[PDB]
Amino acid sequence: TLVSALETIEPEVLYAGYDSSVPDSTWRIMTTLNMLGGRQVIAAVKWAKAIPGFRNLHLDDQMTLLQYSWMYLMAFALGWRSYRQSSANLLCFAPDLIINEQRMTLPDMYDQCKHMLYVSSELHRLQVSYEEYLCMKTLLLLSSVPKDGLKSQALFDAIRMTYIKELGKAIVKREGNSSQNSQRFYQLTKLLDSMHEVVENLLNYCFQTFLNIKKLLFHQ
Amino acid sequence: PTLVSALETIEPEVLYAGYDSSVPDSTWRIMTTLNMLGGRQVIAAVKWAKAIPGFRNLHLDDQMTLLQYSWMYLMAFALGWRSYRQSSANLLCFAPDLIINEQRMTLPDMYDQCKHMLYVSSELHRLQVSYEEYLCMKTLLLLSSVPKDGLKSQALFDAIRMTYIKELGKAIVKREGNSSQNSQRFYQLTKLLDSMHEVVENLLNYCFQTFLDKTMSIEFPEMLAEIITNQIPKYSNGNIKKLLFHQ
Amino acid sequence: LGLEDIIRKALMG
Amino acid sequence: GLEDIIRKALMG
Numbered sequence: 029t030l031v032s033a034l035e036t037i038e039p040e041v042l043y044a045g046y047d048s049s050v051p052d053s054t055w056r057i058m059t060t061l062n063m064l065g066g067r068q069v070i071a072a073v074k075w076a077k078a079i080p081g082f083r084n085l086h087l088d089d090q091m092t093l094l095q096y097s098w099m100y101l102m103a104f105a106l107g108w109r110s111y112r113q114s115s116a117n118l119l120c121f122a123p124d125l126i127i128n129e130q131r132m133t134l135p136d137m138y139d140q141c142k143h144m145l146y147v148s149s150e151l152h153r154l155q156v157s158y159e160e161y162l163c164m165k166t167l168l169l170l171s172s173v174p175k176d177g178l179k180s181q182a183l184f185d186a187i188r189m190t191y192i193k194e195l196g197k198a199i200v201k202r203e204g205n206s207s208q209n210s211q212r213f214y215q216l217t218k219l220l221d222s223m224h225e226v227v228e229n230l231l232n233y234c235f236q237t238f239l240n241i242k243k244l245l246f247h248q
Numbered sequence: 249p250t251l252v253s254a255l256e257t258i259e260p261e262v263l264y265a266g267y268d269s270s271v272p273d274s275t276w277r278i279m280t281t282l283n284m285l286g287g288r289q290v291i292a293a294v295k296w297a298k299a300i301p302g303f304r305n306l307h308l309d310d311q312m313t314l315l316q317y318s319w320m321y322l323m324a325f326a327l328g329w330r331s332y333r334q335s336s337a338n339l340l341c342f343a344p345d346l347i348i349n350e351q352r353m354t355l356p357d358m359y360d361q362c363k364h365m366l367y368v369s370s371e372l373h374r375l376q377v378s379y380e381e382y383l384c385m386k387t388l389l390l391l392s393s394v395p396k397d398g399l400k401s402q403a404l405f406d407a408i409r410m411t412y413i414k415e416l417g418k419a420i421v422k423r424e425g426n427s428s429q430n431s432q433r434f435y436q437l438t439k440l441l442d443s444m445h446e447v448v449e450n451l452l453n454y455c456f457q458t459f460l461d462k463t464m465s466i467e468f469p470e471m472l473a474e475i476i477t478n479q480i481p482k483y484s485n486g487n488i489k490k491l492l493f494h495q
Numbered sequence: 496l497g498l499e500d501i502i503r504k505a506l507m508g
Numbered sequence: 509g510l511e512d513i514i515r516k517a518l519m520g
């Protein structure tokens with residue numbers, strides 16, 4: 029029977045996925061941040077294209093750097109804004125979206141909030157300048173490479189070195205003596221290295237609530 | 249100039265998240281939740297259509313065109329059915345875990361649309377529509393619009409449509425109805441089918457307008473230029489022929 | 496257009 | 509996923 033065929037193929041009702049155990053406010057913060065993050069990624073790719081020496085690289089490498097470094101750039105830009113605006117007290121995601129950690133009732137969220145404040149706290153503790161931050165952020169784009177290697181691995185090695193030199197210049201500009209400079213370079217490069225662990229835990233948290241790489245270091 | 253002055257020149261302005269306080273958290277959650285659920289409901293409707301006897305025999309381009317015209321006819325009619333079977337047309341039963349009380353709703357434009365979605369449900373209640381009538385009617389809603397320049401498999405489309413029209417007659421009969429009341433039921437069920445064109449037009453209008461104001465404009469303002477460009481008509485009065493049982 | 500992607504993916508899949 | 513978002517933004 030033709031009507032029997034229709035009764036058979038009728039799909040089952042779909043569930044909305046509404047979980048009342050998750051409050052409306054925190055649901056709205058999570059979803060708004062997911063959307064904001066999507067737009068920050070687009071903005072990061074547009075920024076990278078404008079970096080001296082970046083488009084000169086191989087299109088597959090440009091693609092793989094951005095795919096490795098997107099959350100490095102966002103968490104770091106988050107740390108900077110949080111330090112400048114709130115002295116590392118709140119997560120300053122956007123001018124119209126400021127998150128107070130002690131308004132986050134589910135523990136996993138709160139612990140991730142606390143961990144994101146670390147980057148901010150270190151930028152505050154070290155009193156990092158705009159010029160230092162700009163150089164450090166360019167270095168975060170060039171901090172992860174595939175074990176299988178890059179196509180334009182030579183031009184990358186050269187450009188990373190030029191940005192390590194521009195950071196040295198930003199440090200120099202604080203007018204510290206040669207001994208203050210070398211310890212400041214050590215401190216800023218240790219923060220850079222610590223980003224790997226920061227991003228892994230943050231990326232873990234984000235996928236957990238939602239559902240080949242060689243991580244370069246300055247210190248071994 | 250210096251390499252760092254270049255970095256300072258290219259640092260993007262911070263993005264606004266677009267958090268509109270005028271919209272309550274519960275309202276925001278309901279309208280974002282319904283958008284996501286609707287995306288999944290469209291996917292389910294495509295899988296369902298692929299399995300409709302006769303549908304995959306049409307040209308692939310026609311199959312695509314029919315689904316593009318009719319996704320919200322199928323969604324709004326199934327919403328009507330579930331709202332009738334669960335609440336007897338008192339509430340919008342979008343999903344078992346998402347039932348909306350039109351009275352505990354903040355905006356009136358939302359309310360009017362809810363009353364319009366409830367109208368489909370109250371009519372299915374009023375006419376005491378059977379599962380088999382519903383199944384035939386829902387199939388006919390997938391076949392309720394065609395391009396004005398016709399489908400590639402137009403003759404097959406017509407034959408399929410007539411087959412399911414005949415199938416609706418067979419379903420009316422099983423209600424154990426009076427011969428005069430059967431010709432009367434066909435008239436009322438097809439009149440409700442015809443009225444879906446206005447229900448959907450008004451619903452898609454409200455949905456697109458609310459979405460562009462409350463979601464796109466607030467949370468992705470950069471998307472707008474390409475959205476409004478893609479929305480431009482190819483023909484002066486469109487290419488959709490809405491099929492009617494009653495002229 | 497955006498809905499068109501969802502429909503074609505689900506249609507071909 | 510995000511690979512497509514990065515591809516669209518880089519190419520455009």
Ligand SMILES: COc1cc(F)ccc1-c1c(CN(C)Cc2ccccc2)[nH]c2c(NS(C)(=O)=O)cc(C(C)C)cc12
Pocket residue numbers: 057058059061062063064065066068102103104106121127137140141231233234235237238
């Ligand atoms: C602008 O956004 C951010 C900027 C930033 F520098 C660091 C983190 C985020 C961030 C994103 C953004 N996406 C795109 C991350 C993502 C990645 C993979 C899968 C899903 C989401 N989403 C967040 C959520 N929502 S959630 C809990 O994952 O549903 C909560 C929190 C905190 C309040 C914990 C933070 C975020």
Ligand SMILES: COc1cc(F)ccc1-c1c(CN(C)Cc2ccccc2)[nH]c2c(NS(C)(=O)=O)cc(C(C)C)cc12
Pocket residue numbers: 278279280282283284285286287289323324325327342358361362452454455456458459462463
């Ligand atoms: C499962 O969903 C539905 C099923 C259904 F049979 C009829 C309507 C909906 C429905 C959708 C779903 N999308 C995907 C529709 C859409 C269309 C065009 C543009 C964007 C979204 N979204 C709704 C919203 N959110 S809104 C206000 O447009 O931002 C509100 C309401 C009511 C509470 C008014 C209803 C809906």
